[model samples]
Target chain A: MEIEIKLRLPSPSAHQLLSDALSPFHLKTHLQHNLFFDTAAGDLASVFSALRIRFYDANAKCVLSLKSRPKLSEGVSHVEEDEEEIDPQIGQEVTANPSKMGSLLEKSRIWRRVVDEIGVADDGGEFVCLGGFRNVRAVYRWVEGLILELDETEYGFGTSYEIECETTEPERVKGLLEGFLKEKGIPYEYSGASKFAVFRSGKLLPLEHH
Target chain B: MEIEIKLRLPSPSAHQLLSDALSPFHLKTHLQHNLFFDTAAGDLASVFSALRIRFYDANAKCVLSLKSRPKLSEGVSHVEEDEEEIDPQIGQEVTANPSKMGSLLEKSRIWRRVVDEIGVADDGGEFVCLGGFRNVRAVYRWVEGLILELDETEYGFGTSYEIECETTEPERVKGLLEGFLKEKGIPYEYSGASKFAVFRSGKLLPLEHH
Candidate 1:
């Protein structure tokens, strides 16, 4: 069973604002203080999937973290067809030479590579819908850049960052974190993750199942 | 040169009355959580300290933990006492059978013997003090036992524990604990460790010193 937790903040965009108010060291503190923000990992998978950090300061000082998981969600939940679309041509070039892809496109290639290698995209499973999603890295950077532009250009502090993870166990994660925090002496709350997400593992392939 | 942490309770007798009101586990928590109690060997020392425990109620809801420190005062203070008392029988133990001695005492003898063999005891320089003190082990055990007993007997529900540690870098220790508690969701205060201590290396002497 999934162990779910919920936390309330003064505002919806708390993470973005806190990033501006706190220093790198304090930010490090927030990361180390939170249970899911694990810095110690021995492998690339753990390093890439088990590590994440973010700040939420829309109206109050808060931080949110996540690790390995099936999915994550943020803000008010709703599904809408994206008005802006990516060119399918970019996807073809990425498949041919991912290294030559722009930084924005490179992240997508990496994600696709992982999905393909894991057989999540081609096995005729639930992963196909997610596999078809394109250029997430470019999209995140675009949003992050826009937020930064808004913060520096208008709001005086609005840069936002999004890190990805895959952690599953939440309670034991909480307990282990408590012991670590006791050693460090930080006040913490398992209020909840700032965002929610949904994902599955496997390959993506071109085709449809009836 | 030394850290001194004082744990102030209602009164000295409160230390004595602690055993009758608390259980061993609760006492251990108080020591570890509220009094900065840590043993050289961790939980092993805590579980086997001089403090005693007994059954309380029919269903075992009530329990007791005895305080084991030799001195009672308004508060618990870590002290560093110089070796003013010389061994009156240093060279006189040759005739006694070594097999009858307790391991704790024997360990102390081996430590002193090494110090004598190396002439550090008579060097009369910084190196003598640098080799560290000899009574650290016993002191740590005594302190840990006392703190555990107090917690079991005195602390009530809703009373969050705040242990005072004065050794060095209070915030660092606090950070260590806060990170842990936040992760585990346990309520605790990490004040660091007492500074004033008799630090000795290995089992050659007695305690857990910085």
Candidate 2:
């Protein structure tokens, strides 16, 4: 489970300010091709879960992630998650053939739980693609021992910028984030919804879901 | 990558003959609950492949296996394979919920390849349970570096007994097996079909699939 905070930056200039503040801790950046999945009737959404296949191109990495049962409002969210590192080529192959999803999963923790939910046990059911979005992710290793992920996402409607910090101690991380943003004068606000939520909605949330 | 020879025992009495032959080499015995899978239309079969989940009770082992594109005729089958060891309880859980097979798989080598063919990329595909069978397996280690798997399988129609010798050098193993059987007067013959094929076609093969 990941306990984290996500905050939407108020303007483009805030990106520069946050980057400048953490210049010494800069890690790397990657262009993310994020794809989300769901049953036609929205099986995953009904269970308060989401599945994502993300291809991190800049680093030649691919990840299959499942997140569920969240307690959230604006930016503070707590959710259960499972992630698997897949072969990069295999990852792209699965993504490439969205309709042949049954080909992507095999045997593991996530597979069992997922197949339990989807229930096409004898034959494959079609994956109603909820479409996808892109994010140019900036990663940093900063002072609070938190790995910060700053995402600049592109949608048909507009662009959204957000900074996320995942922490073990939600209390201390909350304190550290407030101090850093407050001291550095970075304008921010709570983010509403999740990236998948925003992508499915399409009309765009002025503050953003990612 | 288990290369072995499987031969049919002419009668139930042959089970004892073989048991006495390897009395000193005996390891242990197991009751195997084996479940096999495929699409309703036989996607795996179309590729000359099979999927199996074998539960060994005496030892508490669960294996999910996928064997594909084999070169085979009757008892001799050569195929590409992959297997993953899973939690025993998790194994039974998935087996108990057969129709909910999508719940059983996750991310791994077998998962990727299996899903690629089944094609329910986003939603889950159902696993057509080809059903399963039971085997009272007697394991043994004999001369010439062979692990002899003597199977006394009970089919509803009748009973079948088979002995398997898996080896790296088929040539030498062949010599030892022929010499042993010929010398010991253990009646046998080349077997046809896999245990799975036998289970599916209840009108007995007179031999067996291992």
Candidate 3:
């Protein structure tokens, strides 16, 4: 399992301050178009598993993801994930025609795993789009060269700016980042929720519904 | 999901006639040493999943397998499987000290997948050797150019001779094989079970307990 701390920045202005603080370490960015898939009966969710086929920026890169058994507490989310780079054109195909997701899942390893593991169908089922959001992720290195994912995601409900850090030494990294933020006077709060949860929880109305 | 037919043969003598019938194509043999792993708490089984590490004969070939959501009925076993070849020396190390499996699981993808999915341990759990059996498999080509796995596995309960066929067209393949068996006087009974099920179910006593 992987552990990540997701801290919500208090204001968009805070993003500029944090970016400059980590200026010594270069920032790498990517636009992620994540598409979440599930059957009519929510087979994957019933089993506490989910699948995402993601498109990276304007590139011809598509990735298949399998994330399961997620446990979240405070700002740290613990989840097991499996990912593989897939045929580039796959993302373009899905982005153009999302319903083809079912047939597409039958094509590759991680994609097919989602279908088989969820039993989407005996002959294949009708998978619904639980909906997905876009996030601009900026990667920055921290002490001990750990990865820090600074994500700004726009959900139908609102836009969220958060600093995400994945590491084995959570306590050590948390204190270091916490001290830096307090010193810089960047306001923030620990956020335990995942983007998938934010979109699918139905607590907020998606734009298409209106 | 993959579909396979598992038919139990009446006796060992039937093995020869079946081998001769497929002589026109070819018969390939391999001594398979299969080892099954489970946490002391049976975490994998609770989730309806299982993991196996197999060694091929004397060759230094090792394979990691993840098999889940198995459904068996009237000799046809439907199961989802993922297999990947690992470092050749992995089998030698395990066949030498089965206890090292936990640390070894941390090394490979499919291996670590089992650990993460089952949560065998937060740091890592105590995985038990659920016990494993040996099978001599003689693979033969069949009608419609299908692959047939003729396995003779020695179990604690008894030695089992089963012919397994994996295919998409199960019923069509069934009748053809049945006709061939009747004409050649090769006796068989439909067995809706897997090797791992037979060993772990505790219907029979393993020799070590005595």
Q: For each candidate in turn, give its C-alpha RMSD to the true structure in angstroms.
A: 23.4, 23.0, 18.5
Candidate 1: segments with Cα more than 4 A from true spot: A1-210, B11-78, B81-99, B102-104, B107-162, B169-210
Clashes of each: 80, 30, 0
Cα miss at A90, model 2 (Å)? Answer: 2.3
Candidate 3 interface RMSD, angstroms, 1 decimal: 20.9
**Per-residue accuracy of model 3 over B23-105 as CA lDDT, tens digit each:** 54343566888888777777888998888878777754567778898888866778866556666586556555656776755
- Model 1, B145-196: lDDT tens digits are 1112123222221121123333333334435434533564343322222221
Candidate 2 residues lying further than 4 Å off, grouped into runs, are A118-123, A208-210, B1-210
Q: How much is A63 displaced in model 3, in angstroms? A: 1.5
Model 1 lDDT per residue over A1-210, tens place: 122222122222543453332221110111111111111122323323332212222211222212333332321111210011123354334334433433323333333343444333222122111121111111111111111111111111221123221112334433443453346433333322222121122222111212
Chain B TM-score, candidates in order: 0.21, 0.87, 0.86
In model 3, what lDDT does residue A99 have?
A: 63
Arranged by TM-score, best first: 2, 3, 1
Q: Going through the candidates in order, state the TM-score of chain A alone for each one.
A: 0.21, 0.89, 0.86
TM-score of each: 0.18, 0.48, 0.47
True contacts kept of 3: 0.00
- Give the distance in Å from residue A84's predicted Cα in candidate 2 to where it truly belongs: 0.5
DockQ of 3: 0.01
Compared with the true structure, what per-residue lDDT tens digits does model 2 show for residues B12-126? 8887887888765555566888888776677678877788888886436777777776554434544466666666776676666655556556644465667776564422355
Q: What is the lDDT of residue A148 in candidate 1?
A: 12
